[PDB]
């Protein structure tokens, strides 16, 4: 009940359930602070996760997941209740 798969190019994903780095642990918030561009280093794609705003010390990191197309526990007001 936790979807740890990411998308690099549409015929391959990246799994983070058993292996992986700490970068799975990023939550969702449709009011974002971070996004993940697809930057390639040395000829494979990598999923690197940039920032949008100044993030404070011990502030929570956010993200849009972009589940396209068909429940947001963020408790923030201006956000779509579902995902």
């Amino acid at each position: 009940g936790s979807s740890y798969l990411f998308r690099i190019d549409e015929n391959t994903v990246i799994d983070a359930t058993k292996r992986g780095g700490i970068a799975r642990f990023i939550n969702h918030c449709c009011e974002p602070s971070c996004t993940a561009k697809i930057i390639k280093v040395d000829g494979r794609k990598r999923i690197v996760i940039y920032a949008l705003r100044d993030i404070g010390t011990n502030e929570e990191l956010t993200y849009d997941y972009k589940f396209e197309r068909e429940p947001c526990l963020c408790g923030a007001p201006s956000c779509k209740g579902f995902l």
């Binding site: 979807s3 798969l5 972009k66």
Partner: peptide
């Protein structure tokens, strides 16, 4: 569906 993604 539930797979996270960028730009779609």
């Amino acid at each position: 569906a539930r797979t996270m993604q960028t730009a779609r």
